[PDB]
Amino acid sequence: ARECVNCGATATPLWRRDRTGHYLCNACGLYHKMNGQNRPLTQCTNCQTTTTTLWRRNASGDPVCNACGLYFKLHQVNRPLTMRKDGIQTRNRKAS
DNA sequence: TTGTCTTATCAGATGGACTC
DNA sequence: AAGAGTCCATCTGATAAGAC
Ligand SMILES: [Zn+2]
Ligand SMILES: [Zn+2]
Ligand SMILES: [Zn+2]
Ligand SMILES: [Zn+2]
Ligand SMILES: [Zn+2]
Ligand SMILES: [Zn+2]
């Protein structure tokens, strides 16, 4: 399971990375990027989903999932119901 | 195999809750 | 009581995986 190399936290609203590529929680990531030293120690309007790694907002200011949000940004039309994928997907993102 | 397309997952911006 | 400095969830934007 993904662990922050600084504090050891396994839960966080947004995983970030250091220069070498290793993982930091949101709090450790912002601190080290800001300061340059280690840190001391709801559903979608469109598709009605309740599971997403990143919530976004539509023009009116309502919450939409990552997929629905990024889709409208690229189509100027809401994400159709017939595109909704089952379960969760993950990707091996490389560093650099 | 090639390119297109969707959208995970990274990074930066913002703003409210906090401390000095 | 008013301001600047600090913290960090939550937002927007960039990059790019990986299925089609
Ligand atoms: Zn951490
Ligand atoms: Zn490292
Ligand atoms: Zn959605
Ligand atoms: Zn399309
Ligand atoms: Zn600010
Ligand atoms: Zn690829």
Domain boundaries, chain A: 1-41, 42-86
Burial class (CB in 10 A: 0-12, 13-18, 19+), A36: exposed
Is A2:A22 a contact under the CB 8 Å cutoff? no
A44/A69 Cα distance (integer angstroms): 9
Footprint of strand C on the protein (CB under 7 A): A 12-14, 25-27, 30-31, 34-35, 39, 54-57, 63, 69-70, 73, 90-94, 96
Backbone angles phi, psi at A33, to 5 degrees: -75, -35
DSSP structure class, residue A57: E
A41/A65 Cα distance (integer angstroms): 33
User: Helix or strand or coil: residue A28?
Assistant: helix
CATH of domain A1-41: 3.30.50.10
A79: left (phi over 0), alpha (psi -120 to 50) or beta: beta
Query: Which bases on strand C have an atom closer than 7 Å to a protein beta carbon?
Result: 7-18
Same fold, A1-41 and A42-86: yes
- Asked whether residue A93's C-beta has any atom of DNA/RNA strand B within 7 A, the reply is yes
- Asked whether residue A64's C-beta has any atom of DNA/RNA strand B within 7 A, the reply is no
A96/A69 Cα distance (integer angstroms): 26
Single out the residue of A9, A41, A36 nearest to residue A23, CA to CA. Answer: A9
Instruction: Name the fold adopted by A42-86.
Output: Erythroid Transcription Factor GATA-1; Chain A (3.30.50)
